[PDB]
Amino acid sequence: TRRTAFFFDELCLWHAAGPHALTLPVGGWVQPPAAAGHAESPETKRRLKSLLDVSGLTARLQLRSAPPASDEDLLRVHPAHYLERFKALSDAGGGSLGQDAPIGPGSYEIARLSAGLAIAALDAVLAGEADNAYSLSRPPGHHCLPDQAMGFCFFANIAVAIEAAKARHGVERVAVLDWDVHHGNGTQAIYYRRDDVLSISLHQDGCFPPGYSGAEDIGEDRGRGFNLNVPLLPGGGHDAYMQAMQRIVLPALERFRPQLIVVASGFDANAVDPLARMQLHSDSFRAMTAMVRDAAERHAGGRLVVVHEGGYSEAYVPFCGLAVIEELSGVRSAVRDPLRDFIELQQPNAAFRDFQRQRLEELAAQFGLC
Amino acid sequence: TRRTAFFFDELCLWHAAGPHALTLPVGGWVQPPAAAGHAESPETKRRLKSLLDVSGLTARLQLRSAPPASDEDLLRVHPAHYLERFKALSDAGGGSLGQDAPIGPGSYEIARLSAGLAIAALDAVLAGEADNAYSLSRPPGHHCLPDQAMGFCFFANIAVAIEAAKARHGVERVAVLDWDVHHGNGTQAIYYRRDDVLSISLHQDGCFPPGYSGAEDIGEDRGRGFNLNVPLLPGGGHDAYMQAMQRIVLPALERFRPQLIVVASGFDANAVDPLARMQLHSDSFRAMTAMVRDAAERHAGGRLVVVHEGGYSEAYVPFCGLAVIEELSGVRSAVRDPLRDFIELQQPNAAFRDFQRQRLEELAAQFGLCPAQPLQ
Amino acid sequence: TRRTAFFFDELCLWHAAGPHALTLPVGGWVQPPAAAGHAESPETKRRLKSLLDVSGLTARLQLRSAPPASDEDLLRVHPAHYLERFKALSDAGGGSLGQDAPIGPGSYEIARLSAGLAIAALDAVLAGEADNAYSLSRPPGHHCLPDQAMGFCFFANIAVAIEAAKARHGVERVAVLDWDVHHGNGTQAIYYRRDDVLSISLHQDGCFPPGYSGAEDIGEDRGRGFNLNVPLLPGGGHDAYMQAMQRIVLPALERFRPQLIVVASGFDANAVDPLARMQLHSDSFRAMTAMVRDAAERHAGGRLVVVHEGGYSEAYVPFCGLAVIEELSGVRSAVRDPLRDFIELQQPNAAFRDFQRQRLEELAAQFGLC
Amino acid sequence: TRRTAFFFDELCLWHAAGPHALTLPVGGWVQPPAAAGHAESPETKRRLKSLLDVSGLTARLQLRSAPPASDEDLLRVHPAHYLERFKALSDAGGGSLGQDAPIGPGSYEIARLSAGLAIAALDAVLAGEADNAYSLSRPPGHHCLPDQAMGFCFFANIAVAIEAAKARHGVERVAVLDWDVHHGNGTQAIYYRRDDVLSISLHQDGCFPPGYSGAEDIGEDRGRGFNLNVPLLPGGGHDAYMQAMQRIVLPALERFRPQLIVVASGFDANAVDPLARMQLHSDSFRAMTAMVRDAAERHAGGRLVVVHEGGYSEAYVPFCGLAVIEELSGVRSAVRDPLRDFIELQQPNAAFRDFQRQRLEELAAQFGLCPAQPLQ
Ligand SMILES: [K+]
Ligand SMILES: [K+]
Ligand SMILES: [K+]
Ligand SMILES: [K+]
Ligand SMILES: [K+]
Ligand SMILES: [K+]
Ligand SMILES: [K+]
Ligand SMILES: [K+]
Ligand SMILES: [Zn+2]
Ligand SMILES: [Zn+2]
Ligand SMILES: [Zn+2]
Ligand SMILES: [Zn+2]
């Protein structure tokens, strides 16, 4: 077994937007839901923590919290006026900070804590306190721009954590693998002209931001070649992702030689997620974690941090998150995923798999990875 | 104009299974949800009715209920021992009538009413009481086999309605277009060797029942050529469905000359549904309804019945159902679908569209379907 | 059977405040609920409508909607600046209009419709279109002051309806019986110096507004004697209310000779309500309705309007509301209240009943009604 | 200081009955709730744990779980056929184990764990591992009879824990103070003819079981004088409970000289609970806990165990439970109860307080209770 730190704070589960039906603000033609609320709900993360507890896996992890992100840490990425505007709206009982960026009362303090967990997770792994770590950072981060909240993200959690780590530890090469089903536009933008951070996003082609594919966006100037977008066809599942990992991600990491790998781990590529159209099961997430852990072992002395991002199935995210944490820790709990065999039967047929495989081969060639 | 009957009963919204997380029975490693419950929830149909009300659509429809299905009607399809078993379990507070077929307390009476609405909707249209009809039949029907509940369906609503219509009116040719995103396996099985019902299912390849495609299953013996499965690739959206409609569905209806068209209208092909991976928006459903209404006007004297089946997005199903009912009635409300433009941007790219289009062309050829143009 | 109009609009069920746990705004130490939300929820009224439908009673009523209250109607009670402030907050996605007065997006238009239903219900009965009427006016009205939202009420529904009726029909004597479990402070204040409206409130002593009893507040000057508060001891049930009706309410109505009776019908005196401590069952509400209908028949030519106010038990309000509507219409549905016999067993004992009875006798004497 | 053990297991929050509206089984005229479900919901205990966490209280406690109750432990109270019946129903997806005793899938294992936490909490305190303990035992226990589940209780948690403690430690005198707002009928029945357990219940007169008061039920034969019921008038609040504590509970404990005090701590006497009509606030619970902790310090070497029972306000139970745990541990968090001042203003008036006070004075006399002052 490996020593896995689990960064968690109950307060992160207390962030909540005003009334929404899925992602639609209530009002106009949108009736208030009788129960549900915004897709980015506490239950889509709480149920992961609950399952970690009931499985007993929590007892085999190093459980940690952290202080909230300081102004100094936040200001490496975000302007003081952004902090001010966010705080003011949060103090006024919430509202809209951006397009698809709704906040609630006290969301400002809670978002600082989310960012703080990510900072602390990178710190712990670079300090040798754990071999690897998982940070349950809610609200999520990977769509957030320096001065623009987006896609349910209010601070750029991973970028804040990276800039803090560079300041404190002087790490030179960080890879960020973003397997949240949506494009990691925040991470991409921040590091677009940088060669010290390799940003890779696997995402459903055109999902969010809507209509964005991005294969041709490989970074610029000093960063040219240090950003890779893999826009997978909607409907893809396990094979599409395994092919992307083998043909693009692993070769890209091999060439870059990261000293630390950070995963933007959304689970919204799962087969029952409302916010995308991909077909992953819990063993897909297990396999991706195994592959990136192996890459971390080969290049980064094992130094791997997984940061929770998206995932909107209350029923199924917990099984997917559990699989990741089992793989990080090398511990196998008694949990059996009850949907795995069902999802295996729903996968793309051979003709569709081949179609997607050929596109990935072409993309690997475009990237110079063949 | 057009006179659209809306068969609805509030009691259909009172059916509810025991605790589930989406489709997973609670227990073992599945934690009870704090609110949600089984995916087939009352709210996924109630919000449609609410939106019909606030938009002013309900006021422009012929709002009707019906008596529940009689034992006679149900026994045309289901055995007495099935009825007995269902009733006993329903009287005992519910439970599992099969894999993915959970019921709750009183679900037997409510399922009889759901079937009754479908029977009545077909009756009304064949009787000339309305030009067309929509039946909010919950619980749904299209997966139910004669002696096996399946896929949240407990009676074979559409088949029960058809067999009742044949007994009462003597209709000879009925087409059932099933655009619920899952395979209409109940309808297929019941009519598999029959030429008096053309069953067509558009579905996500391999979704539910899991791993079933079915393109080669075209019916047998007397029914050979009277069943068509169109297994669309996961991830497809508007174009995939329009192409399926134009290349397969419309030619198949033209050849069959239905006297009545029934739609098994699930909305779970919508772009945010948890139970499938397709990318339809409300205008996709509107366009499919326009096409089938036109087919009904040409062959069947306008006789078209749409029967609610699946659809699991509480937020988005209402907009999709509203679009269908607007198209049936010829009434356009002030409702603007707030996700339409967003979903448009998420559609498959040209390479993926072409790939799916070529498969549909091959499938139309495999079916021996001639690309005729609509005519009277 | 009588001709009963049922004023209802689906849009009234679409009003919804921001996140609350019961009556507590989310934030600080108050965790967002996983489902529930504000106590004044759509479900506490929707379930009444649903049960009316499933029972078939809806088919035996005269179903009506109405246009929203005009500015002219609203401005008889409320200032233009109140309307403006309410609209602005509603257009900004909601917030707090007052103490225990939270609104949501579009609540302004919905509150106008609620008030419009009440206006229309009084109009219909005074016009002879129905013998009596029930108005499902959500959000409720009876705590609202002219320039101060309070207690989940944003317009003074009943007062707006009365002033509209006086302008259109010239009715001279209206009685308002408020059996919502909380004090009808809005109605009381507006008509406190008026003898053309007799305001009676039955309420739990000190419940809401908190600590208010009010027996000594009988109106002033021209209105002296035309306001009656009956502060019932917490814990009382059927007998306490029957005694209040017989010893105070009926004699008060007999003396006043109303030409129209309006009931502010909250159901929050029911035995499982979270927002009060009283023990009514559905036959209590049936009996109160029978008594006030009889009073309306004796004095007002049958002219009775019941306006929905409070009631916070999703499970039990529907049975209580159904009983009222059965009594108004003279139709008895097949519905059997499944909690009635249970609640009958929980009632105050003889010593407690006698204690409360003696207090009501003393209060009847104070009011000059002995 | 003070070392407080907090017996908690996440799995206790996974017990869930089939659909109910508050306490009403869904079916017939009872519509399924859109969210809520049975009043005995996980959220009414989860929000306590969450608040303990965010307030920093959990970090200052000894957080412990325990193994589930063994068959041996359960069979001290319950028959094997009861265990068998419960397990069978739990394995079949749940249902009704009696009137107001609904279970769900896996509830058997979870109820065993709830009982196990109570057993372990008594063990820990008798073993000197902690000064006192709180056990979040869900599902609750105090209504359960040996062969009859009742009032949302499926095993007699406190009685099972006591009989296990007697077997393991040989404790001779245990007092059970039950301030859950409903009558502790299970505890009363089991120990009704026993002098080794003093059972005291404060409850709303006639609430649950419905119409039961019970002041004249003081135990029989060997147990005569070792059961006390205090049926408080509906509508009572802080003063009623303080008066009951001072005039009845403390004198009764003084005479009994318990070696261990167990509290059946329901929070359903809180001022916003749907399942009773009483008016307690968080400081009422704090004050009761201070009084019983002091009694435990004087008689029992500090040995006090609080076992969670009822409490049905999701919003308000957390503040009440937090106050109890603060008092057990001697730790005061930064939490300020946001309803405390409001509830203070709603309290019975002086006439009503005097009326209830006089009844308690009469009841203390009827019980032959001497008003002694606390001493060591
Ligand atoms: K991504
Ligand atoms: K880069
Ligand atoms: K289909
Ligand atoms: K066929
Ligand atoms: K009142
Ligand atoms: K007056
Ligand atoms: K008690
Ligand atoms: K005893
Ligand atoms: Zn995402
Ligand atoms: Zn379906
Ligand atoms: Zn009220
Ligand atoms: Zn209780």
Written in H, E and C, the secondary structure of chain D is CCCEEEECCHHHHHCCCCCEEECEECECCECCCCCCCECCCCHHHHHHHHHHHHHCHHHHCEEECCCCCCHHHHHCCCCHHHHHHHHHHHHCCCEECCCCCEECCCHHHHHHHHHHHHHHHHHHHHCCCCCEEEECCCCCCCCCECCECECCECCCHHHHHHHHHHHHHCCCCEEEEECCCCCCHHHHHHCCCCCCEEEEEEEECCCCCCCCCCCCCCCCHHHCCCEEEEEECCCCEHHHHHHHHHHHHHHHHHHHCCCEEEEEECCCCECCCCCCCCEECHHHHHHHHHHHHHHHHHHCCCCEEEEECCCCCCCCHHHHHHHHHHHHHCCCCCCCCCCHHHHHHCCCCHHHHHHHHHHHHHHHHHCCCCCCCCCC
Residue C26: closest C-alpha in chain D: D315
Chain B environment of D42 (Cβ under 8 Å): 32, 34
Q: How many residues does chain C have?
A: 370
Q: For residue C13, give how far its alpha carbon lies from the nearest alpha carbon of chain B (Å).
A: 9
**Nearest of A337, D105, D38 to residue B27 by alpha carbon:** D105
| Contact (CB<8Å) D22/C335 | no
3-state secondary structure of B120: helix
Cβ–Cβ under 8 Å, residues C272 and C316: yes
In order of C34, C187, C237, C248, C289, the CA distances from C183 in angstroms are 31, 9, 17, 16, 19
**Nearest of B280, B255, B287 to residue B266 by alpha carbon:** B280
B18-49 CB burial, b ≥16 within 10 A, e <16: bbbbbbbbbbebbbbbbbbbbbbbbbbbbbbb
> What 8-state DSSP symbol labels residue B69?
P
D182 is in an annotated binding site: yes
Where are the alpha helices (H) located in chain C, listed in sequence order? 43-54, 71-75, 80-91, 107-126, 157-169, 185-190, 238-244, 250-256, 282-299, 317-329, 340-345, 350-366
The total of other beta-carbon atoms located within 10 Å of residue C93's CB is 22
Q: For residue C356, give how far its alpha carbon lies from the nearest alpha carbon of chain A (Å).
A: 40
**Nearest of A16, A10, A9 to residue A37 by alpha carbon:** A16
**Nearest of D9, D230, D256, D248 to residue D117 by alpha carbon:** D9
In order of A177, B292, D271, the CA distances from C13 in angstroms are 45, 35, 28
Q: Looking at domain B1-376, what is its CATH homologous superfamily?
A: Histone deacetylase domain (3.40.800.20)
C84-103 residues touching D, CB cutoff 8 A: none
- Cα separation, B269 vs B247, in Å, equals 19
- Cα separation, A152 vs A141, in Å, equals 8
Whole-number Å distance, alpha carbon C322 to ligand 2 midpoint, is 66
The HSE-up count of residue D269 (CA atoms within 13 Å, CB side) is 35
**Nearest of A98, A208, A111 to residue A157 by alpha carbon:** A111
The total of other beta-carbon atoms located within 10 Å of residue C298's CB is 14
- Looking at the partner chain, which of B14, B26, B94 has a beta carbon nearest the beta carbon of D16? B26
As a whole number of Å, the end-to-end CA separation of chain B is 21
Cβ-proximal residues to B6 (8 Å cutoff; 6+ apart), any chain: B52, B58, B61, B62, B63, B64, B133, B134, B136, B325
Residue keyed to tokens 């603000």: A25
- Looking at the partner chain, which of C26, C42, C93 has a beta carbon nearest the beta carbon of A105? C26
Residue keyed to tokens 């909601």: C94
The total of other beta-carbon atoms located within 10 Å of residue A288's CB is 26
D268 is in an annotated binding site: yes
Chain D environment of A34 (Cβ under 8 Å): 34-35
- Cα separation, C285 vs C301, in Å, equals 22
* A50 contact C CB<8A: no
A293-320 CB burial, b ≥16 within 10 A, e <16: bebbbebbebbbbbbbbbbbbbbbbbbb
Task: State the DSSP string of C201-232.
Answer: EEEETTTTTTT---TT----GGGTTSEEEEEE
- Cα separation, C232 vs D333, in Å, equals 37
Whole-number Å distance, alpha carbon C290 to ligand 11 midpoint, is 21
Q: Which two tokens stand for residue C367?
A: 């009011």
Cβ-proximal residues to B325 (8 Å cutoff; 6+ apart), any chain: B4, B6, B52, B57, B61, B134
Kindly state the helix (H) or strand (E) to which residue B202 belongs, with its residue range.
strand B197-204
Dihedral in degrees, nearest 10, Cα atoms C26, C30, C36, C40: -60
| Contact (CB<8Å) B42/D26 | no
* A19 contact C CB<8A: yes
Task: State the DSSP string of B326-370.
Answer: HHHHT---S---TTHHHHHHTSPPHHHHHHHHHHHHHHHHHTT--
As a whole number of Å, the end-to-end CA separation of chain D is 21
In order of C11, C81, C236, C266, C349, the CA distances from C270 in angstroms are 26, 37, 10, 9, 18
* A56 contact D CB<8A: no
D256-275 residues touching C, CB cutoff 8 A: 271-275
Q: What is the CA radius of gyration of chain C?
A: 19
Pairing of strands A227-232, C62-64: unpaired
The total of other beta-carbon atoms located within 10 Å of residue A72's CB is 9
Kindly state the helix (H) or strand (E) to which residue C92 belongs, with its residue range.
none
Relative orientation angle of helices A43-54 and A317-329, to the nearest 10 degrees: 50
Cβ–Cβ under 8 Å, residues B269 and B228: no
Residue list, annotated binding site of A: 180, 182, 268
Q: How many residues does chain D have?
A: 376
Residue keyed to tokens 């940690």: A64
Three-state SS letters, chain A: CCCEEEECCHHHHHCCCCCEEECEECECCECCCCCCCECCCCHHHHHHHHHHHHCCHHHHCEEECCCCCCHHHHHCCCCHHHHHHHHHHHHCCCEEEECCEEECCCHHHHHHHHHHHHHHHHHHHHCCCCCEEEECCCCCCCCCECCECECCECCCHHHHHHHHHHHHHCCCCEEEEECCCCCCHHHHHHCCCCCCEEEEEEEECCCCCCCCCCCCCCCCHHHCCCEEEEEECCCCEHHHHHHHHHHHHHHHHHHHCCCEEEEEECCCCECCCCCCCCEECHHHHHHHHHHHHHHHHHHCCCCEEEEECCCCCCCCHHHHHHHHHHHHHCCCCCCCCCCHHHHHHCCCCHHHHHHHHHHHHHHHHHCCCC
Chain C environment of D349 (Cβ under 8 Å): 205-206, 213, 233
- Cα separation, D107 vs B284, in Å, equals 45
Q: What angle do CA C100, C104, C107 make, to 5 degrees?
A: 100
Cβ–Cβ under 8 Å, residues B184 and B140: no
Q: Residue B315, exposed/middle/buried by CB under 10 A (0-12, 13-18, 19+)?
A: buried
Q: Where does residue A163 fall: left (phi above 0), alpha (psi -120 to 50 degrees), or beta otherwise? A: alpha
Cβ-proximal residues to A213 (8 Å cutoff; 6+ apart), any chain: A205, A206, A229, A231, B349
D9 is in an annotated binding site: no
User: What φ, ψ does residue B249 adopt, rounded to 5°?
Assistant: -65, -55
- Looking at the partner chain, which of D23, D236, D314 has a beta carbon nearest the beta carbon of C36? D314
Neighbours of chain C (3+ CB pairs under 8 A): A, B, D
Technique of determination:
X-ray
- Cα separation, C270 vs C277, in Å, equals 8
- Looking at the partner chain, which of C10, C34, C50 has a beta carbon nearest the beta carbon of B10? C50
- Cα separation, B64 vs B70, in Å, equals 18
- Cα separation, B301 vs B168, in Å, equals 19
Residue C13: closest C-alpha in chain B: B50
- Cα separation, A277 vs B272, in Å, equals 8
Cβ-proximal residues to D271 (8 Å cutoff; 6+ apart), any chain: C277, D237, D278, D279, D280, D281, D316, D339, D343, D346
* A14 contact D CB<8A: yes
Dihedral in degrees, nearest 10, Cα atoms B26, B30, B36, B39: -70
Kindly state the helix (H) or strand (E) to which residue B314 belongs, with its residue range.
none
B-D contacts at Cβ under 8 angstroms: 74
The total of other beta-carbon atoms located within 10 Å of residue B376's CB is 5
Q: Where does residue D315 fall: left (phi above 0), alpha (psi -120 to 50 degrees), or beta otherwise? A: alpha
Sign of the C-alpha dihedral computed for residues A210, A215, A219 and A220 taken in this order: negative
| Contact (CB<8Å) D318/C348 | no
Q: Which two tokens stand for residue B47?
A: 């919000």
Cβ-proximal residues to C92 (8 Å cutoff; 6+ apart), any chain: A95
3-state secondary structure of C288: helix
- Cα separation, C26 vs C30, in Å, equals 5
| Contact (CB<8Å) A33/B43 | yes
Cβ-proximal residues to B364 (8 Å cutoff; 6+ apart), any chain: B247, B248, B251, B371
Pairing of strands A174-178, A260-265: parallel
Q: Looking at domain A1-370, which of 3.30.420.40, 3.40.800.20, 3.90.380.10, 3.40.50.2300 is its CATH number?
A: 3.40.800.20
Q: For residue C62, give how far its alpha carbon lies from the nearest alpha carbon of chain B (Å).
A: 15
Chain D environment of A10 (Cβ under 8 Å): 50, 53-54
Cβ–Cβ under 8 Å, residues B216 and B191: no
Beta partners for C62?
C5
Cβ-proximal residues to D365 (8 Å cutoff; 6+ apart), any chain: none
Cβ-proximal residues to A207 (8 Å cutoff; 6+ apart), any chain: A181, A182, A183, A234, A275, A276, A277, B346
D224-261 CB burial, b ≥16 within 10 A, e <16: ebbbbbbbbbbbbbbbbbebbbebbbbbbbbebebbbb
* C63 contact B CB<8A: no
**Nearest of B241, B189, B177, B254 to residue B217 by alpha carbon:** B189
- Cα separation, B365 vs B374, in Å, equals 18
Q: Residue A126: what residue type?
A: L
Cβ-proximal residues to B190 (8 Å cutoff; 6+ apart), any chain: B77, B145, B146, B156, B159
Q: For residue D290, give how far its alpha carbon lies from the nearest alpha carbon of chain A (Å).
A: 29
Output the furthest CA–CA distance in chain C (Å, rounded). 54
Kindly state the helix (H) or strand (E) to which residue B103 belongs, with its residue range.
strand B102-103
Dihedral in degrees, nearest 10, Cα atoms B34, B35, B40, B41: 160
- Cα separation, A269 vs A257, in Å, equals 27
Q: How far is CA B19 from the centre of its chain?
A: 25
* B348 contact A CB<8A: yes
- Cα separation, D233 vs B194, in Å, equals 72
Q: Which two tokens stand for residue B260?
A: 């009545």
Beta partners for D306?
D134, D263
